[PDB]
Amino acid sequence: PAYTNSFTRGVYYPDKVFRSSVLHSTQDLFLPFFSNVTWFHAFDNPVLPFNDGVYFASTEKSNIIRGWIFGTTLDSKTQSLLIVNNATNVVIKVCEFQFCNDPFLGVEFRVYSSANNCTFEYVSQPFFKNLREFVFKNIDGYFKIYSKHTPINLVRDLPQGFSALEPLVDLPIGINITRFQTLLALHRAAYYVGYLQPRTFLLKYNENGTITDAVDCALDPLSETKCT
Amino acid sequence: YICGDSTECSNLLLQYGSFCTQLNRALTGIAVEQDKNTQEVFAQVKQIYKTPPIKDFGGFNFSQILPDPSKPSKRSFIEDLLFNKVTLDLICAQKFNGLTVLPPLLTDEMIAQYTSALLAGTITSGWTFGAGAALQIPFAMQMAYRFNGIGVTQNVLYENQKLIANQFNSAIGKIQDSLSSTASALGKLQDVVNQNAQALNTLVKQLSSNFGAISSVLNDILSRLDKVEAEVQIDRLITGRLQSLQTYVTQQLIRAAEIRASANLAATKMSECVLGQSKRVDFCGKGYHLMSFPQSAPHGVVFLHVTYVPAQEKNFTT
Amino acid sequence: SRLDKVEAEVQIDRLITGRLQSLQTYVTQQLIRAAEIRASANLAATKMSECVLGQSKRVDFCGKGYHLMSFPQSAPHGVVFLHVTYVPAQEKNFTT
Amino acid sequence: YICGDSTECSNLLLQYGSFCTQLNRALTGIAVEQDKNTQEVFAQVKQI
Amino acid sequence: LKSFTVEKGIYQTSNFRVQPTESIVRFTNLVKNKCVNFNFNGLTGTGVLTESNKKFLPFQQFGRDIADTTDAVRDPQTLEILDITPCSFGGVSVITPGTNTSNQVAVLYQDVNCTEVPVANVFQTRAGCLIGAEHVNNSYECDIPIGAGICASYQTSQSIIAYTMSLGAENSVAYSNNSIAIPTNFTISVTTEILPVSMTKTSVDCTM
Amino acid sequence: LKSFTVEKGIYQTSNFRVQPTESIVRFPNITNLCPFGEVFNATRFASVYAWNRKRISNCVADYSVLYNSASFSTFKCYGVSPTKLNDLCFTNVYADSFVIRGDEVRQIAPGQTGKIADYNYKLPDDFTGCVIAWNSNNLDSKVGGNYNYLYRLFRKSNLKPFERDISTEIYQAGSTPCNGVEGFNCYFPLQSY
Numbered sequence A: 001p002a003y004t005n006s007f008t009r010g011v012y013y014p015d016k017v018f019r020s021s022v023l024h025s026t027q028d029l030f031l032p033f034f035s036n037v038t039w040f041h042a043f044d045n046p047v048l049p050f051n052d053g054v055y056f057a058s059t060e061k062s063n064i065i066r067g068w069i070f071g072t073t074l075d076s077k078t079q080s081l082l083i084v085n086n087a088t089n090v091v092i093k094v095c096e097f098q099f100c101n102d103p104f105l106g107v108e109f110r111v112y113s114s115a116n117n118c119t120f121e122y123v124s125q126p127f128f129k130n131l132r133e134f135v136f137k138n139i140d141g142y143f144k145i146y147s148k149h150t151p152i153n154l155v156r157d158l159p160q161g162f163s164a165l166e167p168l169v170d171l172p173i174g175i176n177i178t179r180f181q182t183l184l185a186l187h188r189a190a191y192y193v194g195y196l197q198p199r200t201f202l203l204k205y206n207e208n209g210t211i212t213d214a215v216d217c218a219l220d221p222l223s224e225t226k227c228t
Numbered sequence B: 001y002i003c004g005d006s007t008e009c010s011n012l013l014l015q016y017g018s019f020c021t022q023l024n025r026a027l028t029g030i031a032v033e034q035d036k037n038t039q040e041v042f043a044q045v046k047q048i049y050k051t052p053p054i055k056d057f058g059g060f061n062f063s064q065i066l067p068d069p070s071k072p073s074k075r076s077f078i079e080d081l082l083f084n085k086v087t088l089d090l091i092c093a094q095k096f097n098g099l100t101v102l103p104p105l106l107t108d109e110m111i112a113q114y115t116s117a118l119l120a121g122t123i124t125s126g127w128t129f130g131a132g133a134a135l136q137i138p139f140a141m142q143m144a145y146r147f148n149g150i151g152v153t154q155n156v157l158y159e160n161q162k163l164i165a166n167q168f169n170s171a172i173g174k175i176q177d178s179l180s181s182t183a184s185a186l187g188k189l190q191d192v193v194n195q196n197a198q199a200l201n202t203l204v205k206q207l208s209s210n211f212g213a214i215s216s217v218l219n220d221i222l223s224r225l226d227k228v229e230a231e232v233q234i235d236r237l238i239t240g241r242l243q244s245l246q247t248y249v250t251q252q253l254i255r256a257a258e259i260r261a262s263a264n265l266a267a268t269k270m271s272e273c274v275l276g277q278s279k280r281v282d283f284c285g286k287g288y289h290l291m292s293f294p295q296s297a298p299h300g301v302v303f304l305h306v307t308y309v310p311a312q313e314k315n316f317t318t
Numbered sequence C: 001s002r003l004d005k006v007e008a009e010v011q012i013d014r015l016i017t018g019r020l021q022s023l024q025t026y027v028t029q030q031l032i033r034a035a036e037i038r039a040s041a042n043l044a045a046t047k048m049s050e051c052v053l054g055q056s057k058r059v060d061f062c063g064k065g066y067h068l069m070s071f072p073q074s075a076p077h078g079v080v081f082l083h084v085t086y087v088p089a090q091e092k093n094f095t096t
Numbered sequence D: 001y002i003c004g005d006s007t008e009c010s011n012l013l014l015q016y017g018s019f020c021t022q023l024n025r026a027l028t029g030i031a032v033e034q035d036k037n038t039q040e041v042f043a044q045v046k047q048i
Numbered sequence E: 001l002k003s004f005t006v007e008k009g010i011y012q013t014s015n016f017r018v019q020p021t022e023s024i025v026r027f028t029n030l031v032k033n034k035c036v037n038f039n040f041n042g043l044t045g046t047g048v049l050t051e052s053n054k055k056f057l058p059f060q061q062f063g064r065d066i067a068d069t070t071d072a073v074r075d076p077q078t079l080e081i082l083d084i085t086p087c088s089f090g091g092v093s094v095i096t097p098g099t100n101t102s103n104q105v106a107v108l109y110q111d112v113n114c115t116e117v118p119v120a121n122v123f124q125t126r127a128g129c130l131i132g133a134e135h136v137n138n139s140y141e142c143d144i145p146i147g148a149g150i151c152a153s154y155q156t157s158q159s160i161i162a163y164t165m166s167l168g169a170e171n172s173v174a175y176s177n178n179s180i181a182i183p184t185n186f187t188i189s190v191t192t193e194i195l196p197v198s199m200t201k202t203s204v205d206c207t208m
Numbered sequence F: 001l002k003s004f005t006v007e008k009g010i011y012q013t014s015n016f017r018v019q020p021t022e023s024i025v026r027f028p029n030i031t032n033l034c035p036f037g038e039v040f041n042a043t044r045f046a047s048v049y050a051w052n053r054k055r056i057s058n059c060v061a062d063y064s065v066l067y068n069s070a071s072f073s074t075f076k077c078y079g080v081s082p083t084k085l086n087d088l089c090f091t092n093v094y095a096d097s098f099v100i101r102g103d104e105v106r107q108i109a110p111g112q113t114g115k116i117a118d119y120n121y122k123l124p125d126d127f128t129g130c131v132i133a134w135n136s137n138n139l140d141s142k143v144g145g146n147y148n149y150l151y152r153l154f155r156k157s158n159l160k161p162f163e164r165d166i167s168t169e170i171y172q173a174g175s176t177p178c179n180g181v182e183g184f185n186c187y188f189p190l191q192s193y
């Protein structure tokens, strides 16, 4: 593991309300700029806290990340959420899965020992050398998945840049989730985790309806002046 | 603005008396004063004097300040620089919320005509035309007597005449490009506009507040609630919006007071300096005052002061 | 006459708030009007001292034309000046 | 001056929102102006 | 004015309304380019609904303005974007000379186009629309100011006339390089000027 | 001025009182008495859809006289304090009486919604007056089922406040038209408690 510094990345569109050339100030769950966070290699995909939200970035060669697991215990005792791929489509299920301590995917579907209390089961449209970034945020209700990918997919720390993910996916599960587990492919990669915190941010909008600049309010009192 | 159409909100607002009338009255008073200010500042001549035929003033070039005879618009050269320097979307949002902007009484072309008459009269007749009927007199004589007004014997002027001319046409040049280099000078005009915006862009977004209610839009309250909770939840919106309107009106009253005081100073300066010769020190800038020339500007006035400064001192025993 | 004590309080609160707000409004406009009158009276004092006690070369501050003398008169809440001034007329042309 | 700790009071304040700006603005509009007055009365001579 | 007699001047009455006279319900068929009442997924609004030129994202439904308002809306059945404009425009003022003098009046509508009638002689001007008056092309001094260089009065058979402001009488100066003008006679002129000094003191006992 | 030391001058103080010194009561010369005693003890109270109305005038309306043997579990007042009842005069006195189910009692008020308030008996929001409600199972109920009391269950539109409607037309619940006779999805609006 190592330390990742957020070079003005982790931006996303805040709400579904159209704007154009508006310079507007908001407050929401963001990733503070230049923040030092943990970065993992792959070999470990452990269970990590999910108190607020995750900006999850994956660098790999191709489809190494099998998917994601969410829950509070990751066992049949409590309800768990599984996001996986069948090589053509993404499948999202909320069930009291009996998740083993090593839910590996050998490429044996040993993610879950048993399937009961299938409260949700859904299939969607079809989806180093690949840097895919996702934003997962959860309320006791609907769940938001934002997606992006970059062609600057190198192996070392991410280069300085600026783009905004979109609220591509919103799906209700209603269940309580506090922990997450990465699902890799046991082939016979690396990933960035970014915690989301309550922060105020200023957003700059161009001639057309998009976001192309932002200012972190709490970085330094100079930023406070820019806010005022 | 308080009710946003719909009848129930106006029905409630009727019970709050007639606060809704006197704020209209105060804004009316402000606008009438705004008209009276300019009309009193610029209309101190009762005769529209034409630009004089031919141009020969002993070597004084006036082509910059006098209006262009060829341009259908009567803005002079320096006036063009100024009218291009100062500028003037939520503009449509102001009309969308009943914030009506009213046109000023005089047309800025009429201001051009007034100031053009002032310039022509002053350079053709000295200070006499302020007294009554205008009486013509040659320009060199006027300059001589204006020197004699501050104690320099008039003969001086003639024996240096050509030299003096060379300075004036130079000095105005130094002013000209000056305005086109930095506009920080026009800031005292610009602020007068800028503050206005900061008021309205507040007053409009002041609608986003709640004052404790459950939704900041009246129609949402009406759609979500019955006929007995509507009053108890809308009274707080009514109170808050009435509060905001009162705050805006009071700010306008104070700023109008300050602008009125400055307008009185402008009128006094125009009457004492352009239209005559004044012994009051530093009332026309540094040095002993000789003469003045006025120019229009967006909701404001520009004065050019022409003064006399000695230099190259020598010692003597007295 | 109609309601009990706690109801009386929860009713009279609104009336006292509203009436006090009205009185606040009235006092504010009185203050502003007083300031404007004060400026006008200050100008009157300067003018009376300059144009009655003495003679001034300032132009158009005392009426059109060259100024000779002045007379004061009183009036309800105000003062009125008669300016006696001098105006030339019947101009003629000459060569200089 | 309004809340003084008790973050609940500040959250309640934010529904009124804008007001706290103009207060802090208005005084500053006065506060700077004062110094200017002093200068106009004493800084007319440009030498020592 | 809360009075039965009115002095010479101009007074404000109210802002103009322009009724919608139509209600549209969107889950009513789609209607465009008419000042109507409309509803979108429970949201109520009123105005003219015209085309749009924005680029709403697939999850976007409402594009909001600063004053709690939305200017661009997506239809709930055909999912195309449209722009909205309310049109309740125009303050109304009444120009009248003294009531003791006559009873005809003139009506001024502010910033509204004459082409947009909403009303039941007609003159389009920089201030808006002016009705009741007859326009002339001469010049006199001001009697009642309308705006933007237009001022009106009552004149003779008798009606109300609007005209351009008169700056003043024309004149010209016989300037040259050797001519002078000298007075020969003089007059003593006596003029009046008036200044207020005070107002009426008042006292209020708040408690009672 | 809130100090022990005050400089020389003049000051404004509180207002002059002028005491009242006397209390006087003027009153009409009415000496009658209200029929409330028989009104409340009345043997028959009508059904909710046929609520009974009475106008009272020219009498004295003491309310303590009820409490000799009064039994009112449910009491409510709007726009007036019961305490001041004996200290006021009332131009119009209208008394309405009926019998309902206890569970529907909460429906009778200004602004409440429900079957009775929307179909039988409606009250204005600016109403002032009183509501007196007591259980009467000991007298208004009998073995074998007491059905003398009826109510309106179906109606085309909600009634106005203070509206008495006793229409008995067969309500058309379904889309099939009413042919002036009982039919499918066409029901008599009256039902028996």
Ligand SMILES: *[C@@H]1O[C@H](CO)[C@@H](O[C@@H]2O[C@H](CO)[C@@H](O)[C@H](O)[C@H]2NC(C)=O)[C@H](O)[C@H]1NC(C)=O
Binding pocket: B061, B062, B063, B064
């Ligand atoms: C009088 O005023 C004008 C304004 O400058 C001058 O004449 C022209 O000035 C511009 C720029 O200063 C030059 O480009 C032109 O070549 C000038 N033309 C002429 C004929 O001079 C000049 O100061 C004065 N012109 C005259 C005839 O005196």
Ligand SMILES: *[C@@H]1O[C@H](CO)[C@@H](O[C@@H]2O[C@H](CO)[C@@H](O)[C@H](O)[C@H]2NC(C)=O)[C@H](O)[C@H]1NC(C)=O
Binding pocket: E185, E186
């Ligand atoms: C200067 O102005 C006066 C103003 O009228 C004129 O004087 C008149 O002259 C004749 C005889 O000279 C008198 O009969 C008139 O009574 C004078 N008029 C007045 C009002 O007094 C005349 O224009 C000039 N003064 C003189 C003496 O000629």
Ligand SMILES: *[C@@H]1O[C@H](CO)[C@@H](O)[C@H](O)[C@H]1NC(C)=O
Binding pocket: B313, B314, B315
């Ligand atoms: C006049 O004499 C003083 C005394 O030495 C000297 O300082 C000064 O320079 C002289 N004046 C000028 C203008 O030089």
Ligand SMILES: *[C@@H]1O[C@H](CO)[C@@H](O)[C@H](O)[C@H]1NC(C)=O
Binding pocket: F037, F041, F069
């Ligand atoms: C009402 O009914 C009971 C029983 O008949 C009776 O005792 C009582 O006196 C009656 N109420 C009054 C005020 O008479």
